[PDB]
C-alpha cells in the first residue's frame, strides 16, 4: 500500500522566504484592488455640500443657505464648492476644515450684537439672493452716511454653553484708500480681538487685488474657539464684518473629498476621491490617501497568499 498527496494541473505561483514562484495548489489575494466608483453611504447621515464650501457653512454665502445648521455623520466636499461669495479668504483655512469635517454638523446661535449710529445693511451684488445681499451669518459694518465718521464700538460675547463656540469675523480690504475713507471715514482703522487664549489686532490693507467676482476688494475671514464661560471682545471702528451667529459642534463625523455619486444601497467605511473601498483584505493598492477604517496601503499590486500545499504535477 502506497500513500501520497493531491495535485492539480494548473497551480498558482507564490513567493516564499526561500524561492520566488513556488507553484502551489491554490492561493488567494491579500492586496485589494477592486473599487466601487460610488460613495457608499448606507446607514449614514450624509450631507453632499455640492456647490457650497465647507467653510461657507459658518459664514453663509447664498450657495450655503441650506447648510447653515446641517447635521451629518459623513461630510462630502465637491470640487465645485465655494467658501465665499464676495472674494475673500480664510486664515488657517485647512485647520478649520479639519475641525468641521469631524464636527458632526453645526448649530448656530444668535450672538446678540446690537448696534447704534451706523449703517449695518452693507451688501454686494456678488452675494445675490433676491437682489444684492451679503453673508447670512455676517453683517458688513459701514458708516452711517456716504462718508461720515464711523464711531468707535466695542462688542463682547460670552460663551454660555458647555461646548466651545466657533467665532468668525472679517476684515474688509477696499479697492483703494478712497473707498475705505468712503465706507468707514478717514483716519487709521483698527480692529482688536481678545479672549483668554487669543489676541490681535488687525489693520486693513486697502488696495487693488486680482479681479474675482468682478470685485477687486477682499475680506479676510478669521476665527477662534471660545471656551465655556470664556468671553471674547471686539474693539473696532471700521472695515469690520461682524459676526451675527456663532457655531457649535454637534457631535462627531467624517469628512471626505470625492467626485463620484452618492449610493445609499452599498455600505463601507473606507473612502477616497474615486469611490469606496469595500474589502476584508488587510492591504489595498487603490489610494494611499484613503480615509476611514481602511486596509493598510502598500505599493505591491498583488501578494498571493498560499492556501494549498506544494503542487507537484505529473
Amino acid at each position: 500500500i502506497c500513500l501520497g498527496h493531491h495535485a492539480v494541473s494548473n497551480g498558482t505561483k507564490v513567493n516564499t522566504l526561500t524561492e520566488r514562484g513556488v507553484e502551489v495548489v491554490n492561493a488567494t489575494e491579500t492586496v485589494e484592488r477592486t473599487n466601487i466608483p460610488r460613495i457608499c453611504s448606507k446607514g449614514k447621515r450624509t450631507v453632499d455640500l455640492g456647490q457650497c464650501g465647507l467653510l461657507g457653512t459658518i459664514t453663509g454665502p447664498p450657495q450655503c443657505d441650506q447648510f447653515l445648521e446641517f447635521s451629518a455623520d459623513l461630510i462630502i466636499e465637491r470640487r465645485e464648492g465655494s467658501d465665499v461669495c464676495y472674494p475673500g479668504k480664510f486664515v488657517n483655512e485647512e485647520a478649520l476644515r479639519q475641525i468641521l469635517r469631524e464636527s458632526g454638523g453645526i448649530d448656530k446661535e444668535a450672538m446678540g450684537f446690537t448696534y447704534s449710529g451706523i449703517r449695518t445693511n452693507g451688501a454686494t451684488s456678488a452675494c445675490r439672493r433676491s437682489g444684492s445681499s451679503f453673508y447670512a451669518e455676517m453683517k458688513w459694518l459701514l458708516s452711517n452716511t456716504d462718508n461720515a465718521a464711523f464711531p468707535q464700538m466695542t462688542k463682547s460675547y460670552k460663551n454660555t454653553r458647555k461646548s466651545p463656540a466657533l467665532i468668525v469675523w472679517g476684515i474688509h480690504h477696499s479697492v483703494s484708500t478712497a473707498e475705505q475713507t468712503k465706507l468707514y471715514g478717514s483716519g487709521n482703522k483698527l480692529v482688536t480681538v481678545g479672549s483668554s487664549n487669543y489676541q490681535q489686532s488687525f489693520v486693513p490693507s486697502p488696495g487693488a487685488r486680482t479681479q474675482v467676482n468682478g470685485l477687486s476688494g477682499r475680506i479676510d475671514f478669521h476665527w477662534l474657539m471660545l471656551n465655556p464661560n470664556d468671553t471674547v471682545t471686539f474693539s473696532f471702528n471700521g472695515a469690520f464684518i461682524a459676526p451675527d451667529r456663532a457655531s457649535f459642534l454637534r457631535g462627531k463625523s467624517m469628512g471626505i473629498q470625492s467626485g463620484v455619486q452618492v449610493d445609499a444601497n452599498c455600505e463601507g467605511d473606507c473612502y477616497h476621491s474615486g469611490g469606496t473601498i469595500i474589502s476584508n483584505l488587510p492591504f489595498q493598492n487603490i489610494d494611499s490617501r484613503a480615509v476611514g477604517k481602511c486596509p493598510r496601503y502598500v505599493k505591491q499590486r498583488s501578494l498571493l497568499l498560499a492556501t494549498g500545499m506544494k503542487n507537484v504535477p505529473e
Partner: protein, 163 residues
C-alpha cells in the same frame, strides 16, 4: 513532498490519502484526519490575517485646494515612509506565511507517513519512495483496517516474518 516524487491529480477526495494495490484489487481513499488538520491550520492563518482595523484615520491633505507646500511636503514624506514600512511588512508577512504553510503541509505528510509506518511494525518494510511493501496478502478489509488505525500489529506477525 520530498521522496514522494509527485502528487496524485486523481485524488480529488482530500489532501492526503492511500492507494493500496493488493490481490483483490486497488483502492484510493483520502485520510480525513490529516487533511482536516492542515485545512484547520490554513483556515486559522486565514482567520488571523484577514482582519478589520478599528482605527480611523482622518483627512490630513486637501485634493481640491492644496495646503502649504512645506507642511504638504512633510505630509507626503511621512506618508511615503509609512507606505514603505507597510509594503515591507506585507511582503515579508506573505513570504513567511507561505514558507510556514508549505513546511507545515510537508510536516503533516511526514506525520501520516511515520504514523502508518508505526502501525506496521515488522509486518511491512519501507521501499524508499513512500510505500510499505507488505510481506503478506493484506485483503481489502485489512487495508480498511489500516486506514482507520485498527490493524493488529501482532495477528499478522509470524506470517510476514517468515517472508
Amino acid at each position: 513532498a520530498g521522496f514522494i516524487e509527485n502528487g496524485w491529480e486523481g485524488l480529488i477526495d482530500g489532501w492526503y490519502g492511500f492507494r493500496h494495490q493488493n490481490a483483490q484489487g486497488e483502492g484510493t481513499a483520502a485520510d480525513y484526519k490529516s487533511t482536516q488538520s492542515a485545512i484547520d491550520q490554513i483556515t486559522g492563518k486565514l482567520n488571523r490575517l484577514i482582519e478589520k482595523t478599528n482605527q480611523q484615520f482622518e483627512l490630513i491633505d486637501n485634493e481640491f485646494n492644496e495646503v502649504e507646500k512645506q507642511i504638504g511636503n512633510v505630509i507626503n514624506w511621512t506618508r511615503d515612509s509609512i507606505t514603505e514600512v507597510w509594503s515591507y511588512n506585507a511582503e515579508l508577512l506573505v513570504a513567511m506565511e507561505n514558507q510556514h504553510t508549505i513546511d507545515l503541509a510537508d510536516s503533516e505528510m511526514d506525520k501520516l507517513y511515520e504514523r502508518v509506518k508505526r502501525q506496521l511494525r515488522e509486518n511491512a518494510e519501507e521501499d524508499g519512495t513512500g510505500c510499505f511493501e507488505i510481506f503478506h496478502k493484506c485483503d481489502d478489509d485489512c487495508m480498511a483496517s489500516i486506514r482507520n488505525n485498527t490493524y493488529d500489529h501482532s495477528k499478522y506477525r509470524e506470517e510476514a516474518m517468515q517472508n
